[PDB]
Amino acid sequence: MGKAENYELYQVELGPGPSGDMAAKMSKKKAGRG
């Protein structure tokens, strides 16, 4: 059975980086005191 093969593959097909579009864009936008 499949879990999310078409799920993650769909995200990588939409934006560029898979884990670089949700917490990374918000980490630099609101980092300041890190």
Curated annotation (Swiss-Prot):
Compositionally biased spans, kind Basic residues: 26-34
Family, as annotated: Belongs to the cation transport ATPase (P-type) (TC 3.A.3) family. Type IIC subfamily.
Location in or out of the cell: Apical cell membrane; Cell membrane
Species: Sus scrofa
Protein's gene: ATP4A
Modified residues (Phosphotyrosine): 7, 10
Ranges for region Disordered: 13-34
Function as written in the Swiss-Prot or TrEMBL entry: The catalytic subunit of the gastric H(+)/K(+) ATPase pump which transports H(+) ions in exchange for K(+) ions across the apical membrane of parietal cells. Uses ATP as an energy source to pump H(+) ions to the gastric lumen while transporting K(+) ion from the lumen into the cell. Remarkably generates a million-fold proton gradient across the gastric parietal cell membrane, acidifying the gastric juice down to pH 1.
Positions of post-translational Phosphoserine modification: 27
Protein's name according to its UniProt entry: Potassium-transporting ATPase alpha chain 1
Subunit organization: The gastric H(+)/K(+) ATPase pump is composed of the catalytic alpha subunit ATP4A and the regulatory beta subunit ATP4B. Interacts (via the P-domain) with ATP4B (via N-terminus); this interaction stabilizes the lumenal-open E2 conformation state and prevents the reverse reaction of the transport cycle.
